[model samples]
Target: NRTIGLDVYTEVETTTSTLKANAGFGIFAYQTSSAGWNSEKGNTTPNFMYNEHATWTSDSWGYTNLRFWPIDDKKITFFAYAPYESKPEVGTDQKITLSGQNAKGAPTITFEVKTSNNWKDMIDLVTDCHTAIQDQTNESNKGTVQFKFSHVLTQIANIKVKPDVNLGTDTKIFVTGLKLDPGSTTLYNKAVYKFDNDTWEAISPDASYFSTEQDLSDFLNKTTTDQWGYNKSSINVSDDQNATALFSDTEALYFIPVNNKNGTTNAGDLKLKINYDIVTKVTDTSNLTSTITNKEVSLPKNTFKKGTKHTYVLTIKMNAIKITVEDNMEGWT
Candidate 1:
């Protein structure tokens, strides 16, 4: 994205005195054909939005931009307040451009002229001078607003990437997690079920959760762990480009939402579920089975955007447990 010019050296102002008059005000810039201020030429004009009106001014002195543009070059009759007046004068539709320096070492402006002569006409002349400011205020100028690709992802705030694992195991267990908070658990619960609990604790054939293929791939990439929940690792990271990295696997991610955190905030909720085919390698498909376990974890929120690289902390829990005595230990036997 590019920078859109405001067409003003500094601040834009509106005077209460001139507002009573029928006169209206706004901003604009010169066209390709007409490059400067004019009256007879009816120069290319950009209409500015204004509730009241005045001139642009600042600390700079070079030919600067103005936010006001003149139209019709006519005066309206209403209240007028000169430098010293208990009450404003009526029948005044005159606005002027006063230019000077601004506090930021930039230029300043004031509308001080009450010109009857065409050249000295304050409102008409100022309007004709600000073609650029008018253009900048329009929606067309939004195209020029500078925005980086990384910034786009940052704007998105929350992101989830999951992958499908095709292992040639007897039971195809899809493994994945979320980068959200505890409350978001409802998403997975709604889709999968836990057989040991005889309820929705794990995946369910009846429900569908994931939408894309990457969802499956990213899910399996969660940090590995031992049979116990003690050995935990963070998500693996892969670079897609010099500027962007993907979270390789993430199973413990969840969303807590703003309101859920505190206040009447109720920021809403985000829950994601992943689906993948558990396939066996060329060497094996039956008997030798692998139980794909999902571990839960969390990380800083901003790290989940498209171009962000993040390391995570994970916690693993048992789907079921088997107990054996010390005498029954394999090594002891």
Candidate 2:
């Protein structure tokens, strides 16, 4: 009588910031009597496993009462989402409503984006589905259910900026804002993960956002001494991307995945904004003059799919702006 256990891995990208040892995930699993009954599996509820939360207690990831592997040719199917739903933001929503996760005939989950959230309090929604093999060849995976998860949200890992050659020599530059506009006030905050082909569908439609509104900027954004170049009057910076990859106190922005709409074709412009002041020269960096706000800055082309980390680097200039986008999808190859 072989008992069923669980194993997990993520088939996604770099800096996998989720699913740590103590961090848990919610699972929805179903099973068919035998391989002969494959047609009826993972489609109904009151299944082998119904919305169970599994925790990593050092070794195996387990939850609830124990379940044994079927002695017959039965197939076990599993679906999961991360962080165990303990946050107050998610805790309030009915658990099974994951919203309305009744059965596997195309399931949907509702995610509410908060109007105000510190970088650390956001959710890192990741999902995965697996149909356990009747018999395993990789001996190590024989008695366990192997689940490979994937991130389901988009992230703005960091925003970097450097002054263009024409900017003031002795003048200081202090940033006030850096934001991403999705072209619409409402974006799809819900998702559907179809198990047939193991894929996802982004539903259509929120004012969900993060704001860099006030003249107040981030701590690290100033670089040093409220200037682009420490103390040098000429102002030079690190040409290396990683070296200068700084933002609001080194915090990354995590938000929902959205469609990238072109400003020319759409009303909102799907762009980035830069609010800065090329304050004065004359060792007179005290003067906060020339409030230059770049409202129509463009971004790279993409449909903004899930599980991808995007890094936007903007070159602040006196008259124009330059931008570069780096995606951690296939990452630097």
Top candidate on TM-score is: 2
TM-score, one value per model: 0.21, 0.72
lDDT of each: 0.24, 0.51
Model 1, 77-120: lDDT tens digits are 11111221111122234332221111111111222223134212
Q: Which TM-score value belongs to model 2?
A: 0.72
Global CA lDDT of candidate 1, please? Answer: 0.24
Give stretches of model 2 more than 4 Å off.
10-18, 36-38, 41-43, 86-96, 99-106, 130-140, 166-169, 190-243, 246-250, 259-268, 284-288, 319-333
State which candidate has the highest lDDT: 2
Q: List, residue by residue over 219-289, the lDDT tens digit for candidate 2.
A: 22444344422342222232333324555544655455654221123333356666655656544334435
